[PDB]
Ligand binder design. Structure first.
Ligand SMILES: [Cl-]
Ligand SMILES: [Cl-]
Ligand SMILES: [Cl-]
Lengths: 267, 268
């Protein structure tokens, strides 16, 4: 039986177990930004909560997890949900899952019609990295407006949102700037996980549109990678499948990618 | 006086600190630490030394103005030039927001404005309130962010993406609280610290579920939030809009008084 989950505090043990089973650390924006906003549902076997999933506003699953002993029942359940058969979850179009979420992926594969790759998940290898070095500085409170103006002009995110997002990163000391003669040439993020994945750092960059192709992005990832290493964290990052320039920089910053976020549609 | 645009707010560290030191009471957190740092900033230069500044928001309204204290006469000349739209660099300014606690900036607005209206009331807490039943609020944890976001989105219409960041950050700062019943939020309370200038105060906010108005809840929330501030050694302040009669009533019942106002002035 399936119920809407009132309080996400009921899922504590099962979430930890879900993340533990991942082959690699999962993408922070997907699983710590979007997933928590999504509607959750608990799977209850005889009044004990033994699983959950969550479905976004567009009608896409983002997570699914049943306690490891319910194989044949797991298959039937997933097929039910994926085939619109739950009065209580309703119309589910599809799923987003990575190649690091084996069980969830497996069931997606069995019950989906088509797919596309959403993004690449990378991890850092020390051996894969004499590149020229830059210095970046920790963003201070007073620099907030300059970072917001920068990000807005270069990725088009909304200012009000960026003000809060970067406000928070500045408090966490996770935002960095590459400055040249008074202007920002890049913003870098070295983001820590508050839970489950506390031994990793998730990296992001924006390079000024006026200075693409100068190899800035790769120097930024190198810097952020070292800043992560000095805190004892291993670096990961991700990017969209059609973002060729990001993929280039990342690979030249010594990252490799054996993982993908895929978007499946149900039959 | 040369007016110059200012990119790095670092250039204004000292001038800003004097601006705030000069205030009669602590100023509103959302106005002065949320909005003002997002606004466009200009500096006032005597002979290539930076001796004052102002900031103009997106709508064309001044939010802050300050000249080193010894420029009384030039200050008036300056403000008038800027208010009658003759500043090449600053451009067309429509008006100003200013409180009754910023005496110098207010004076100049008074001198140069055509019309006005009140925007909000600023209150502070006199330890002459209330043996009265006190509610228990629970500090928000990460797990409850979405419930808070949904609660605020439904009750005040702010956007969810924005709320997710604003509330995520409050949760990390331990400034957000919830008043719960049967798994649902009856109200949300904020007890916010200031990182600089006003570190002896806590700035409070609340949202009462629209399904539970007129049941005394906001008063009780404010009372909790004041006590939580007091355990941190902080004095409580808050503000609300001039049309928010329910808020004003709860605030004044929670033992707060108001000698101050934020006013919106329109320029002649
Ligand atoms: Cl630094
Ligand atoms: Cl109570
Ligand atoms: Cl209760």
């Amino acid at each position: 039986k399936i119920k809407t989950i009132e309080s996400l505090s009921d899922l504590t043990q099962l979430k930890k177990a879900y993340f533990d089973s991942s082959i690699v650390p999962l993408d922070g924006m997907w699983h710590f930004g979007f997933a928590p906003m999504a509607k959750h549902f608990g799977f209850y076997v005889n009044k004990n909560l033994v699983g959950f999933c969550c479905v976004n506003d567009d009608g896409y699953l983002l997570q699914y997890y049943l306690q490891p002993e319910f194989q044949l029942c797991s298959q039937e359940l997933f097929t039910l949900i994926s085939q619109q058969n739950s009065s209580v979850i309703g119309e589910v179009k599809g799923a987003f899952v990575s190649t690091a979420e084996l069980n969830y992926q497996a069931l997606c594969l069995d019950n989906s019609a088509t797919f596309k790759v959403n993004s690449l998940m990378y991890q850092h290898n020390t051996k894969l990295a004499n590149l020229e070095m830059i210095d970046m500085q920790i963003a201070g409170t007073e620099q907030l407006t300059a970072f917001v103006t920068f990000a807005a002009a270069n990725i088009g995110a909304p200012e009000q949102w960026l003000t809060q997002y970067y406000g928070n990163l500045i408090e966490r000391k996770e935002l960095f700037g590459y400055w040249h003669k008074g202007k920002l040439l890049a913003a870098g993020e070295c983001r820590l996980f508050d839970q489950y994945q506390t031994e990793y750092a998730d990296l992001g960059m924006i390079v000024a549109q006026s200075n693409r192709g100068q190899g800035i992005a790769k120097k930024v990832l190198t810097f952020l990678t070292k800043h992560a290493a000095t805190q004892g964290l291993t670096s990961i990052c991700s990017t969209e499948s059609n973002n060729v320039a990001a993929q280039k920089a990342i690979a030249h910053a010594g990252f490799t990618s054996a993982h993908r976020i895929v978007q499946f549609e149900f039959k």
